[PDB]
RNA sequence: UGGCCAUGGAAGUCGGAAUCCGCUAAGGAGUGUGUAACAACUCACCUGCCGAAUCAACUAGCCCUGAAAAUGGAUGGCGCU
């Protein structure tokens, strides 16, 4: 289900913060992480060096911790016959933390989504860069492989390389020895050529397409001989497949030796398709704020507000606004409310005084609101679209519109 | 479906003739759902009110019915848009009591004037909007800050004057409602005799 | 309230419906809300605590504003007290299989009901009044395990207790 | 602009149409089959659409 | 009567389970238009005028649409109503 995968991506993104915050000592910690293809017996293998060599660390407090470290994820490994798909992320240590807590910690786990990073570390404090910066690419490309011997399906994440499917083809020969038969056989020979870029054009909507509506935020072609070509302007391609075609690649090679020869090539393109979504998604906001209109948004004074009242339709945001949401509470009467406050109003502020009794407001702890848009726009109007600083259109939105602002349902008013 | 209730429709107005011996004639016109329920509301307690059609002309089959004289009477006057308010409280209270009733409806843009219709000096209540509207047929108003001022008393239309689509629109903007009516009575009857409205 | 801002009186009502708990897609205020004096989140905590412990399956909620004091009241719908007096209560959250129960009797309930309408109807007592109430339940159906139809035809109580 | 009688004076002229499905016939909006006999009086028509 | 499910808004109206009573002369818990949602408009029952047939759904005959080819052309030709 779509629910539970989206339960299960929140439980590893808690998880992920969880582990980041942690810190401890010297190089007390272990960073592990195995790709799916891998086996168990070769990392087991490698720990147990990386133990052998552990046993001459000078200095106490780090040797013993890490040892123990090293036979804890051994042990764990030990459970595992194989490597499960969407590789293994194994996080040990000893944690130092209030209370003078110095606690050991073992965190196996496969990720969802597949995995293509390995990585071993120690290190003071855990190293989950490779996890976060998955979750934020979770963009699928397609990849369509032409060839005159035979076709070749598959799929690229910002880490992972898949294969969907390929075939090969008995196609015939390029002459034929007869004057009369010469055109005749060359038609011929057209005629299975173009039925093989229909083959590969239906298979590609059997296979990229999802509800009638493709699954992968691109698509690209990579062949040779002008066969790309014949699948990429050709009225048998499907329009709803053919819009999403972003490369027509020009590689040595076929098959899934040319298919990493493709992505290397088509790198700079499959990076730009974030920057490009951004661009057409910011352009639209402004257009409403170059005309009258009044379809808008900006600042959280306002855009919660539409948020809260008549409904946002998207609602724009940028990565680092920082802006954080406490909750702040009354020591005697009981009375609370819940602020959205910047870097230097947050930090140090004497406004929160209760005033009106007479007592000191006090600020109990926050969240902050990249994280709370997250949490709960599906309860209210919906489409949280992160947007970088990176385009001429979202420099403006970060640098002068504070980062936050919102395509509306309808028309709104505002006043104060 | 509409045999039965035909025959039901007959049990209705046989029973109100029977029960009630006064019944007042009154014209529906140009008249709202509204407006019945709301003399409905107020006319509750003694009178009833119904509206019918040419099986009110059958008023003959209550006539052969063994017994009664009197209602052959009231056969040429069953023409127009009409319903009846069967009761039995009183004559000239009653007719005091639907004329004292009443709406305003706003104007029909076509029909005759009853009364001589004003323009009091007021203002409109809207912005700087189109003085055009109201100066094209001749009507003297200022945009005296804002607001659409008629800066004059004046007579646009006089009894039996047909009341054109541009100055009717005006009146409905205004919220200036002299037209229509509600419903009127043209005839009586009473314990057999017939009065007109007298 | 209208050349620029100036309280005569201010009575002024206005009709909301639906509010079992402070909903977080809200619409309470704006529009009508800010101009007039009537704040947002405050006014969204006193609608609360009028519409609390019962009705939270759904609710009506005109508005009566003093000023800055809003005057939250319940007026009956006739399914909204049905629902009310249902098999109460598994509020929200599971739930979700679903509302629609309806076996819950009400026979001299229902009386309360159409005693409690503000008049109307154009009725000649409630004699007609029971067949409206007692098939304007959706869920309910009726007595113990009786139809709606035309078992309220032959309707043998309170003719003469109503008024 | 436009006085809004004259408009739709026009109006009936111009848009107050039915529009055959198979032949694109312009007819009148009481039309309930086509005029055209390049299309056998279809009977498929739809209004003209409005400008909005 | 903001009916219920649905809140993302459906108080008749994206959809769906429902789907009855009152007033009734009579209006569907609604054909659509359109609305964020209403509103506003539009679509029975009955009259007023007019003055005998009216109307629906099938069906099969001829005729017509469906019906586009390359030298100029063939119910055999001329012609034929
Ligand atoms: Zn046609």
Redesign the pocket.
Same mark, same amino acid.
């Given at each position: 289900s779509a629910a539970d995968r989206n339960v299960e991506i929140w439980k590893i993104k808690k998880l992920i913060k969880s582990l980041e915050a942690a810190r401890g000592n010297g190089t007390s910690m272990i960073s592990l992480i195995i790709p799916p293809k891998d086996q168990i017996s070769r990392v087991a293998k490698m720990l147990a060096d990386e133990f052998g060599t552990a046993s001459n660390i000078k200095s106490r407090v780090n040797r013993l911790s890490v040892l123990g470290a090293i036979t804890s994820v051994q042990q764990r490994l030990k459970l595992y016959n194989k490597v499960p798909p969407n590789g293994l992320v194994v996080y040990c240590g000893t944690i130092v933390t209030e209370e003078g807590k110095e606690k050991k910690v073992n965190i196996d786990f496969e990720p969802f989504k597949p995995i293509n990073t390995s990585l071993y570390l120690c290190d003071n404090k855990f190293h989950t860069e490779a996890l976060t910066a998955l979750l934020s690419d979770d963009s699928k490309f397609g990849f369509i492989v032409i060839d005159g011997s035979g076709a070749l399906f598959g799929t690229l994440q910002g880490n992972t390389r898949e294969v969907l499917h390929k075939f090969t083809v008995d196609l015939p020969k390029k002459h034929g020895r007869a004057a009369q038969s010469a055109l005749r056989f060359a038609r011929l020979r057209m005629e299975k050529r173009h039925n093989y870029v229909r083959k590969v054009a239906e298979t590609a909507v059997q296979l990229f397409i999802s509800g009638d509506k493709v699954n992968v935020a691109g698509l690209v072609l990579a062949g040779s001989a002008d066969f790309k070509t014949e699948l990429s302007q050709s009225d048998m391609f499907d329009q709803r497949l053919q819009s999403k075609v972003l490369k027509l690649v020009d590689i040595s090679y076929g098959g899934e030796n040319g298919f990493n020869q493709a992505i290397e090539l088509s790198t700079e393109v499959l990076s730009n398709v974030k920057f490009i979504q951004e661009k057409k998604l910011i352009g639209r906001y402004f257009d409403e704020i170059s005309q009258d209109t009044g379809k808008y948004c900006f600042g959280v004074e306002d855009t919660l507000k539409a948020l809260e009242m008549?409904?946002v339709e998207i609602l724009i945001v940028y990565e680092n606004l920082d802006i954080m949401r406490y909750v702040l509470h009354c020591q005697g009467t009981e009375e609370e409310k819940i602020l959205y406050l910047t870097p230097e109003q947050e930090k140090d502020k004497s406004h929160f005084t209760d005033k009106e009794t007479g007592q000191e407001h006090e600020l109990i702890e926050s969240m902050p609101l990249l994280e709370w848009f997250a949490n709960n726009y #599906? #309860?209210?109007?919906?489409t949280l679209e992160i947007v970088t600083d990176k385009s001429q259109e979202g420099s403006q939105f970060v640098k002068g519109f504070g980062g936050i602002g919102g395509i509306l349902?309808?028309?709104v008013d505002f006043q104060g | 479906d509409?045999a039965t209730?035909?025959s039901?429709?007959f049990l209705?107005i046989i029973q109100l003739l029977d029960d009630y011996p006064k019944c007042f004639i009154v014209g529906?016109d140009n !008249?709202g759902?509204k407006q019945?329920?709301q003399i409905?509301m107020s006319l509750?307690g003694k009178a !009833? !009110?119904?509206? *019918?059609?040419?099986?009110m002309?059958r008023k003959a089959i209550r006539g052969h019915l063994e017994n009664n004289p009197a209602l052959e009477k009231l056969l040429p006057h069953?023409? *127009?848009? !009409? *319903?009846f308010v069967f009761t039995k409280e009183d004559l000239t209270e009653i007719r005091d009591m639907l004329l004292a009733n009443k709406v305003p409806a706003a104007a029909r843009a076509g029909a005759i004037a009853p009364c001589e219709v004003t323009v009091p000096a007021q203002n409109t209540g809207l912005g700087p909007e189109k003085t055009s509207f109201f100066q094209a047929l001749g009507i003297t108003t200022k945009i005296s800050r804002g607001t659409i001022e008629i800066l004059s008393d004046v007579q646009l239309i006089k009894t039996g004057d047909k009341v054109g689509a541009s100055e009717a629109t005006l009146l409905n903007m205004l919220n200036i409602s002299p037209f229509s009516f509600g419903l009127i009575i043209q005839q009586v009857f009473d314990n057999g005799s017939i009065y007109n409205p007298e | 309230m209208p050349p620029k801002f100036d309280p005569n009186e201010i009575k002024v009502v206005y009709?909301?419906?639906? +509010? +079992?708990e402070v +909903?977080?897609?809200s619409?309470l205020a704006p529009?009508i809300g800010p101009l007039g004096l009537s704040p947002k989140k405050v006014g969204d905590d006193i609608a609360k605590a009028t519409g609390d412990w019962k009705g939270l399956? $759904?609710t009506?909620k005109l508005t009566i504003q003093n000023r800055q004091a809003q005057i939250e009241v319940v007026?009956? &719908?006739? &399914?909204?007290i $049905?629902?009310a007096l249902k098999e109460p209560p598994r509020d929200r959250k599971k %739930?979700?299989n679903?509302?629609?129960s309806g076996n819950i009797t009400f026979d001299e309930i229902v009386n309360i009901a159409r005693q409690m309408?503000?008049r109307?109807?154009?009725? =000649?007592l409630s004699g007609? $009044?029971? =067949?409206?109430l +007692?098939? &304007? %339940?959706?869920?309910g159906c009726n007595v113990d395990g009786r139809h709606?139809?035309?078992i $309220?035809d032959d309707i043998n109580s309170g003719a003469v207790e109503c008024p | 602009i436009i006085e809004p009688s004259l408009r739709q004076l026009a109006q009936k002229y111009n848009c107050d149409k039915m529009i055959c499905r /198979?032949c694109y016939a312009r007819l009148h909006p009481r039309a309930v089959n086509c005029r055209k /006999? /390049?299309?056998?009086?279809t009977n498929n028509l739809r209004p003209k659409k409005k400008v /909005?």
């Open positions: 008549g409904a #599906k #309860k209210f109007g919906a349902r309808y028309r | 509409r209730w035909k039901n429709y209705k529906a !008249v759902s019945m329920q409905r509750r !009833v !009110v119904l509206m *019918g059609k040419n099986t002309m069953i023409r *127009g848009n !009409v *319903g | 009709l909301r419906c639906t +509010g +079992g +909903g977080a897609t619409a529009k399956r $759904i009506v007026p009956s &719908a006739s &399914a909204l $049905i629902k %739930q979700k679903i509302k629609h309408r503000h109307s109807l154009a009725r =000649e007609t $009044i029971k =067949e409206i +007692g098939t &304007a %339940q959706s869920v709606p139809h035309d $309220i | /198979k /006999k /390049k299309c056998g009086h /909005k």
